[PDB]
């Protein structure tokens, strides 16, 4: 079986094009998870520029892309990542234009 | 835990009238999770808003995709189990059927 363990929002990086580390905690130690993108009720045109997020695991596989360009829109990808012995993992998250302060996120999917 | 397959949603014919999508080629009698995805779509190639909802015929959850620029949502997940023939059915509805963009879902298993 498979299930959604919990939903987490992506961080909002401070600087355009410069990745920040997002740490996720509270999961089972030494366990494989799959992350998929999602967002709810966002106005991506509240100010100028385009919301474009990319996220990868520091150690793992996959890239999540959320590109809200109005004639070429993408929500795709996944991340495969394993927790450490403390139930945590790190992602690298980059916003192409950091003034886009909309909220997006991912589901954390687990075997059961 | 991985994506086994990605499949496109059907494009229903009539606004607000659900149609059945059958997914095949999966493991028999196995639980899957579905989450939405799409690539390089122009949701403004014509007038009206792309708004899709999908639910399993047997299972739970709803995927919602509302590309309204004022209130954009790409969300929800479906839990569904295949029959003994590796298939399952979804019920898919477009609010405005003239929006013929392509969207879809991941099929996830462990």
Numbering used by the authors:
A (entry chain B): 7 to 118
B (entry chain A): 8 to 117
Passage from the reporting paper:
A major factor that limits the expansion of shrimp cultures is, however, infectious diseases from viruses, such as P. vannamei nodavirus (PvNV) and M. rosenbergii nodavirus (MrNV), which have inflicted heavy economic losses. The Nodaviridae genome comprises two single-stranded positive-sense RNA that encode the capsid protein for viral capsid assembly, the RNA polymerase for RNA replication, and the B2 protein for host RNA interference suppressor. While the shell domains (S-domains) of PvNV and MrNV contain conserved sequences of 62% identity, the protrusion domains (P-domains) and N-arms show low sequence identities of only 17% and 43%, respectively. In this work, we have determined the cryo-EM structures of T = 3 and T = 1 PvNV-LPs at atomic resolution, the crystal structures of the P-domains of PvNV and MrNV (PvNVPd and MrNVPd), and the crystal structure of the S-domain of PvNV (ΔN-ARM-PvNVSd) in the T = 1 subviral particle (SVP).
The PvNVPd forms dimers in two crystal forms with the asymmetric unit containing one dimer (space group P21) and two dimers (P212121). All structures of the PvNVPd were refined to resolutions 1.17–1.22 Å. The structures of PvNVPd from two crystal forms are similar with a root mean square deviation (RMSD) < 0.3 Å; and residues 250–368 were resolved in both structures. First, the crystal packing of PvNVPd (P212121) reflects the intermolecular organization of the two P-domain dimers with a bending angle of ~110°, suggesting that the existence of this putative conformation in the T = 3 PvNV virions arises from the simultaneous rotation of A/B dimer and the translation of C/C dimer. In the interface of this parallel model, the three turns β1/β2, β6/β7, and β7/β8 from one PvNVPd monomer are in close proximity to those of one symmetry molecule in the absence of metal ions. Notably, the sequence of the interaction region (Gln273–Asp278) of MrNVPd is distinct from that of PvNVPd, and two types (P21 and P212121) of PVNVPd structures do not exhibit the X-shaped conformation.
